[PDB]
Design an enzyme around this catalytic site. Structure first.
Site, mmCIF file in Angstrom:
data_model
loop_
_atom_site.group_PDB
_atom_site.id
_atom_site.type_symbol
_atom_site.label_atom_id
_atom_site.label_comp_id
_atom_site.label_asym_id
_atom_site.label_seq_id
_atom_site.Cartn_x
_atom_site.Cartn_y
_atom_site.Cartn_z
ATOM 1 N N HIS A 73 0.333 -1.352 -0.092
ATOM 2 C CA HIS A 73 0.163 -0.347 -0.157
ATOM 3 C C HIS A 73 0.795 1.609 0.782
ATOM 4 O O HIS A 73 -0.027 2.473 -0.456
ATOM 5 C CB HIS A 73 -1.186 0.072 1.039
ATOM 6 C CG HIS A 73 -2.485 -0.743 0.722
ATOM 7 N ND1 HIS A 73 -3.030 0.426 -0.140
ATOM 8 C CD2 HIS A 73 -2.760 -1.469 0.337
ATOM 9 C CE1 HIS A 73 -4.277 -0.209 -0.010
ATOM 10 N NE2 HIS A 73 -3.668 -1.752 -0.389
ATOM 11 N N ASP A 137 -8.658 3.269 8.957
ATOM 12 C CA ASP A 137 -8.920 3.657 8.366
ATOM 13 C C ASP A 137 -9.155 2.239 7.051
ATOM 14 O O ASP A 137 -10.389 1.944 7.327
ATOM 15 C CB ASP A 137 -8.908 5.112 7.761
ATOM 16 C CG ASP A 137 -9.323 6.263 8.682
ATOM 17 O OD1 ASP A 137 -9.557 6.513 9.546
ATOM 18 O OD2 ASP A 137 -8.829 7.641 8.169
ATOM 19 N N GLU A 250 -13.115 12.141 13.570
ATOM 20 C CA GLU A 250 -12.675 12.019 12.205
ATOM 21 C C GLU A 250 -12.705 14.017 11.619
ATOM 22 O O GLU A 250 -14.036 14.206 12.511
ATOM 23 C CB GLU A 250 -12.162 11.232 11.806
ATOM 24 C CG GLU A 250 -11.030 9.783 12.086
ATOM 25 C CD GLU A 250 -10.702 9.003 10.415
ATOM 26 O OE1 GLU A 250 -10.251 8.559 10.786
ATOM 27 O OE2 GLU A 250 -11.079 9.573 9.315
#
Ligand code: FAD
Ligand SMILES: *[C@@H]1O[C@H](CO)[C@@H](O[C@@H]2O[C@H](CO)[C@@H](O)[C@H](O)[C@H]2NC(C)=O)[C@H](O)[C@H]1NC(C)=O
Ligand SMILES: *[C@@H]1O[C@H](CO)[C@@H](O[C@@H]2O[C@H](CO)[C@@H](O)[C@H](O)[C@H]2NC(C)=O)[C@H](O)[C@H]1NC(C)=O
Ligand SMILES: *[C@@H]1O[C@H](CO)[C@@H](O[C@@H]2O[C@H](CO)[C@@H](O)[C@H](O)[C@H]2NC(C)=O)[C@H](O)[C@H]1NC(C)=O
Ligand code: 245
Ligand code: NAG
Ligand code: NAG
Length: 496
Positions: A73, A137, A250
């Site tokens: 990633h 997340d 958030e």
């Protein structure tokens, strides 16, 4: 010459050099840079990792840098091994036994293989009524990968990043030695590896702290047109008491130009909600709209639902969002945690997932977040078509261990700022890359002491500034001790 154990890996077909193998290990989520390795290792056990690192350590003149690919990633090749060896960590979890994820008998923690992805850690934990306390997340990342960075999400303000929730780990150093570490044992290696960007060794096991698994999450979104009220309320909800009721906090920034579409694409707001917010923006004549996103975890207790209502009502009563702009949803805990997965599926079908991701991630000291808002959200970003969410939320430095490698701003409160730009447009990449340079430039000129996150610098002076001169020397000391040959994770461009 090849040590017998190393040659054995090749003999067993674990060391591949075929194009198929090397190619797959040459690109990452960033989709901006790529580098072909000489080979790729598919280990079936930690012993295979020992064999590789041991050969490298004892073999004079070893010329192969080594990287540990979790799920790749990374955004700018941090998981590549140009002309070297890329370890396909996922291979450690092929066998159906022994398990790579074990919840402790007392349910206080969960042992997970460094290659395991957080989504599976979640499932195995829930099966035992528990679950990690700090997340990311997106759940399709590996334990060892997020731990080599920091691992942040809406729970970090109170539980600290994922690196602050590790009891101990099993690490194989650049010397090829299997070492168990923690605050009590081999603490120097323990601190170095967490946020260590894969420079000192590979994490084969991480003992992760857990808490009794909640059953549901009251999920809410509050809307603001005033940044001052927005940030003041986020700071109020995450301020140290011990922390408030909220389990997660958030925030989002919506530029006026694509307000309706971006609100609709949150998957949270209904078309009716969207119309109201769009109207609000026009009434206030706002070029930007802000939304706080928070949750309250609770269980199946018969009184829970009503107890959460009262609790939520109390908290909301202390905030300053626009009157009537509180939006609620109620879902199962696991559904909330894995919320981003649905967005991935959708984007991929549209062929909008495997595209360049010139993401800009950083930590901005609270004292300058308002200036950042003015210079970026209300400035540089205005007048452009934005594709991707703009995430902003405060973190408490007290929950970060500065002894670890991860670098953070000096202020007690600093914001995680994540601009997840997707280069969906034709060759819109070059523009986004320049835009990120402009943003950083703006911050440097304004005197903002930020820290980048998930980024790899290409100049030594940049990494020294990133860590801080003194902390840098400590980083080097640990480098000379655990990876003297400077072969590990060359893609970070720190010692390579
Ligand atoms: C693609 C992505 C990434 C991401 C995210 C959402 C998406 C769609 N949301 C995040 C979030 O909410 N919070 C957060 O802190 N990070 C988030 N990320 C970024 C992610 O953490 C990084 O991409 C991270 O690198 C994890 O990704 P992955 O597990 O795939 O690792 P990699 O990119 O393959 O490798 C990264 C570096 O770490 C070293 N490494 C990898 N595994 C190990 C082990 N086991 N031991 C030691 N070092 C390891 C690599 O060599 C590399 O340098
Ligand atoms: C999870 O627990 C199992 C046992 O319940 C552990 O299995 C052992 O693993 C080692 C090497 O990892 C083997 O040499 C042993 O033969 C295994 N024993 C069993 C019971 O098969 C496993 O190591 C644990 N993994 C984690 C998550 O730490
Ligand atoms: C927010 O963006 C909208 C566009 O979505 C802007 O509305 C446009 O304004 C121009 C000139 O003011 C008109 O010619 C367009 O017809 C409008 N588009 C729409 C919505 O039909 C709006 O001006 C922006 N608001 C702010 C404060 O910048
Ligand atoms: C509504 O908001 C817009 C944008 O903030 C205001 O327009 C700006 O006005 C200033 C000074 O008049 C200019 O320097 C900016 O260039 C304008 N924005 C742009 C780029 O169009 C507008 O004045 C506000 N409406 C009012 C007068 O209440
Ligand atoms: O990436 C996110 N957060 C993040 C990413 C990198 C660093 C820190 C946070 N969040 C997120 C939310 C919805 N969709 C996607 Cl693809 C991603
Ligand atoms: C980016 O992704 C595209 C589409 O899968 C691919 O053709 C290209 O080779 C990738 N480029 C990089 C730098 O990885
Ligand atoms: C909460 O209730 C749901 C449905 O009643 C159930 O599936 C879940 O297992 C419960 N949570 C716990 C404590 O496991």
């Amino acid at each position: 010459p090849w040590p017998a154990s190393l040659a054995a890996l090749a003999l067993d077909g674990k060391l591949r050099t075929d194009s198929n193998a090397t190619a797959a290990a040459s690109t990452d989520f960033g989709n901006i840079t790529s580098a072909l390795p000489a080979a790729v290792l598919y280990p079936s056990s930690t012993a295979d990792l020992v064999a590789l690192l041991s050969a490298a350590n004892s073999t004079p003149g070893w010329p192969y840098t080594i990287a540990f690919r979790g799920r790749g990633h990374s955004l700018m090749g941090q998981a590549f091994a140009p002309g070297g060896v890329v370890v396909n960590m996922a291979s450690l979890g092929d066998a159906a036994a022994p398990p790579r994820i074990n919840v402790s008998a007392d349910g206080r923690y969960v042992d997970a293989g460094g290659e395991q992805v957080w989504i599976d850690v979640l499932r195995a934990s829930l099966a035992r009524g528990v679950a990690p306390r700090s997340w990311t997340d997106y759940l399709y990342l590996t334990v060892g990968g997020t731990l080599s960075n920091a691992g942040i999400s809406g729970q970090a303000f109170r539980h600290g990043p994922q690196i602050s929730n590790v009891l101990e780990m099993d690490v194989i150093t650049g010397h090829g030695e299997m070492v168990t570490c923690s605050k009590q044992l081999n603490a120097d290696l323990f601190d170095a590896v967490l946020g260590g960007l894969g420079q000192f060794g590979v994490i084969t096991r991480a003992r992760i702290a857990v808490e009794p698994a909640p059953a549901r999450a009251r999920w809410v979104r509050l809307v603001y047109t005033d940044f001052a009220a927005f940030s003041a309320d986020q700071e109020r909800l995450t301020a140290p008491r011990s922390f408030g009721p909220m389990s997660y906090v958030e925030g989002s920034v919506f530029v006026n130009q694509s307000l309706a579409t971006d609100l609709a694409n949150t998957g949270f707001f209904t078309d009716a909600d969207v119309a109201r917010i769009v109207a609000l923006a026009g009434e206030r004549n706002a070029t930007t709209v802000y939304s706080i996103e928070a949750t309250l975890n609770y269980d199946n207790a018969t009184a829970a639902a009503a107890a959460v209502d009262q609790e939520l009502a109390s908290v909301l009563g202390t905030l300053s969002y626009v009157e009537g702009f509180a939006f609620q949803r109620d879902v199962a805990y696991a559904a909330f945690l894995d919320r981003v997965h649905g967005e991935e599926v959708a984007l991929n079908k549209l062929g909008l997932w495997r595209v360049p991701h010139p993401w800009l991630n950083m930590f901005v000291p609270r004292s300058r977040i308002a200036d950042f808002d003015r210079g970026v959200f209300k400035g540089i970003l205005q007048g452009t078509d934005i594709v991707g969410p703009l995430i902003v939320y405060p973190l408490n430095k007290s929950m970060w261990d500065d002894g670890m490698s991860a670098a953070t701003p000096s202020e007690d409160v600093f914001y995680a700022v994540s601009l997840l730009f997707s280069s969906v447009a034709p060759n819109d990449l070059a523009r986004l890359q320049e835009q990120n340079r402009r943003i950083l430039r703006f911050c440097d000129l304004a005197g903002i002491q930020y820290k980048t996150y998930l980024a790899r610098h290409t100049d030594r002076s940049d990494w020294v500034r990133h860590f801080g001169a003194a902390k840098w020397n400590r980083f080097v000391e640990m480098k000379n001790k655990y990876d003297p040959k400077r072969l590990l994770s060359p893609g970070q461009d720190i010692f390579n």
